[PDB]
Each structure stands twice: as C-alpha cells, then as structure tokens.
C-alpha cells in the first residue's frame, strides 16, 4: 500500500497499436503507445516517469508513464504518452521559453 523506498526498473516490450487495441479497443488514441502485458506493470507513483529504449547507443525517451489496468495487472498493456507524437511540441515550447 506504500511505495518502495528504492528506485525500481523493469524491462518490457513495446506493443503494436493493433495488439494493444485487442484489450483496450478505442481507448488507445494517437498520442499513446503501449508496452508491457509481459509480467510487469507500472503502478501508482510511476506516472510521468520514463519508458526508454536504446537508439544509436543512447537511452531515448519513447514513452511517459500514463495509465493502464486499474489494479496494475501485469498481463494487460500499459499505456504511455507517445513521445514521438509530442516531441515537436516539446521543442517548440523550449524554443519559446
């Protein structure tokens, strides 16, 4: 019922939108990406943290923890904000501020 003191990590696969929609249907929108359903789950307190993949040797922010199973089930897809769909907004915001 309380959070861990020490930072946790989990490896997990990205899911295609098609396989993600097999569970969540039309709740999956264009700035979302799914990952997991693989025996691990993000859960309360993880939101806003990273989902990173390697790209050319360096860890790259691919998702932002967002929502999923209301009991943090490890067999359903976790849903993450899809950074590629939002990074133009990120760069525009930094450039203007």
């Amino acid at each position: 019922a309380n959070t861990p003191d020490r930072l946790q990590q989990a490896s997990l696969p990205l899911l295609s939108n098609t396989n993600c929609k097999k569970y969540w249907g039309t709740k999956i929108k264009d700035a979302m990406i799914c990952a997991g359903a693989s025996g691990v789950s993000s859960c309360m307190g993880d939101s806003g943290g990273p989902l990173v993949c390697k790209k050319n040797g360096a860890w790259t922010l691919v998702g932002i923890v967002s929502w999923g199973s209301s009991t943090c089930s490890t067999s359903t897809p976790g849903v993450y904000a899809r950074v590629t769909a939002l990074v133009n907004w990120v760069q525009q915001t930094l450039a203007a501020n």
């Binding site: 019922a1 959070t3 861990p4 003191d5 020490r6 930072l7 946790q8 990590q9 989990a10 490896s11 997990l12 696969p13 990205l14 899911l15 295609s16 396989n19 709740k27 929108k29 700035a31 990952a35 025996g39 691990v40 789950s41 993000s42 309360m44 307190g45 993880d46 939101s47 806003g48 943290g49 990273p50 989902l51 990173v52 993949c53 790209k55 860890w59 790259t60 922010l61 691919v62 998702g63 932002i64 923890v65 929502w67 009991t71 943090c72 490890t74 976790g78 849903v79 993450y80 904000a81 590629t84 769909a85 939002l86 990074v87 907004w89 990120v90 760069q91 915001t93 930094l94 501020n97």
Partner: protein, 131 residues
C-alpha cells in the same frame, strides 16, 4: 512498478521524483536538459511542487540529492482530461540541475523515429510494487 527489480543506484540519472512541499512523492519525471523536466499532464504539477534529482533511496536522509524549484509549468493545451490523450507537461526549473555522475539527461527522439513493436525497453520509478 509491479514485479520489477531494484535499480543499480544512480544508473537512471534522468529519473526525478516530483514531490509536494512536504516531500511527498506523487509522480516521476525525466530531465531532458539542465533546465527542463518532462512529465505527465495528469500529474497536475504546480510551481509549489519540487523536482528531486539524484535520488535512489527515498528513505535515506543522507543521500546527496538536488531539490530544484519549478519556475513555470507548461501543460500541453491539447491534454484531453476525458480520453487522457496528449498526456505531457514540461517543467521549467528556476535553478539549473547540476549534471553529475547521478544527474543527467535522457535523449529525445525525432518525431519520425520508429521504435518497432517487440523492442525491449525499460521503465523506472518509485510507484507501488503491489496494488
């Protein structure tokens, strides 16, 4: 994270903890440079909350962390509070993070980057390990 494992201390140096003024952890975030953190819009961050960088063990009072005030919150105006779409917020720090062994930035993709289904990626945080 349910059924994850403990990180090697300091090995995810962009991971920040978003806390209220009493130190209560309510969300994670990622440093993208020394002045900016990216997090989720539904976290509802305000300039009274603080970014804690360099943390591993939230129950250790002796760990060397950086507690960074937030100057301005930039919630994506397209965040949809019904469908949860466009769930992203940027935090402009009032004082720069000092990059170090345990504090540094994640890379950002380009909009056209393709990350294939089935790729093994990693997520991190201090969320519940059991619901």
């Amino acid at each position: 994270i349910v059924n994850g494992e403990e990180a090697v201390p300091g090995s995810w140096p962009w991971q920040v903890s978003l806390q209220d003024k009493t130190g209560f952890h309510f969300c994670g975030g990622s440093l993208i440079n020394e002045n900016w953190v990216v997090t989720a819009a539904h976290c509802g961050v305000t300039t009274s909350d603080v970014v804690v960088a360099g943390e591993f063990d939230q129950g250790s009072s002796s760990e060397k962390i950086q507690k960074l005030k937030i100057a301005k919150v930039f919630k994506n105006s397209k965040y949809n509070s019904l469908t949860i779409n466009n769930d992203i917020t940027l935090l402009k720090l009032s004082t720069a993070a000092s990059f170090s062994q345990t504090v540094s930035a994640v890379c950002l993709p380009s909009a056209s980057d393709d990350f294939a289904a089935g790729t093994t990626c990693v997520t991190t945080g201090w969320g519940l390990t059991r619901y």
